[PDB]
């Protein structure tokens, strides 16, 4: 098992995130709970993979909108290829989450449950990013569900300065702003999370202050960008 984890670390050092994602996927398929380090490795690997796909898709879509029937058809076909790759990565992550990660969370493991539900909402949001028309509706709703649940749990059993809760609030506000075009709800959520973390900012002591302050500054940046 540790050979797979050190292979994932090697792949990360080699900037080969496909192999890192495959190694962490095997570790997850071992059906055993993931440690904090392994959880972060899996998150980082699949985030880098889907992020490369999202960057390519945004480039191709910008070029398609910025621009001959044959050239346009070729651009659209390449965008479809990248869309299929991105949706496949997202479906792989969602299957890993529904089959192993979320399923192996005990009724009290609120931290890992919030982490995995935030991941689920993130990848459903990544699906909704490229979805158009009728098919978009469902993949929005799922992203709203996985976030919402993850919110309540994190609202009940986690401190407002917890980095998992702060990142969940950040991605949830981003969802409300860019996917549902509800800037009022997004700003409300982001500001509530930011001020709740500010009120209890003294509780961070040299061990979790950076991982919380970075997400709080991201919240502030999104808030100043939206208003």
């Amino acid at each position: 098992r540790e050979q797979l984890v050190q292979k994932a670390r090697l792949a990360e050092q080699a900037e080969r995130y496909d192999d890192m994602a495959a190694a962490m996927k095997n570790v997850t398929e071992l059906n055993e709970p993931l440690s904090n380090e392994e959880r972060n490795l899996l998150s980082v690997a699949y985030k880098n993979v889907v992020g490369a796909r999202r960057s390519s898709w945004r480039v191709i879509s910008s070029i398609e909108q910025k621009t001959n029937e044959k050239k346009i058809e070729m651009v659209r076909a390449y965008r479809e290829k990248i869309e299929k790759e991105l949706e496949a990565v997202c479906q792989d992550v969602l299957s890993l989450l529904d089959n192993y990660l979320i399923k192996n969370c005990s009724e009290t493991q609120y931290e890992s449950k919030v982490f995995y539900l935030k991941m689920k909402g993130d990848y459903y949001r990544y699906l909704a990013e490229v979805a158009t028309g009728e098919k978009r509706a469902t993949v929005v709703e799922s992203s709203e569900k996985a976030y919402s649940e993850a919110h309540e749990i994190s609202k009940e059993h986690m401190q407002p300065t917890h980095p998992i809760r702060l990142g969940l609030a950040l991605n949830y506000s981003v969802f409300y702003y860019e996917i549902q075009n509800a800037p009022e709800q997004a700003c409300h959520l982001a500001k509530t999370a930011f001020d709740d973390a500010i009120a209890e900012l003294d509780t961070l002591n040299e061990d979790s202050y950076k991982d919380s302050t970075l997400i709080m500054q991201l919240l502030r940046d999104n808030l100043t960008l939206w208003t």
Binding site: G167, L170, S173, Y177, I215, N222, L225, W226
Partner: peptide, 6 residues
Amino acid sequence: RRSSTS
């Protein structure tokens, strides 16, 4: 410039 996520 799009919104920042984690």
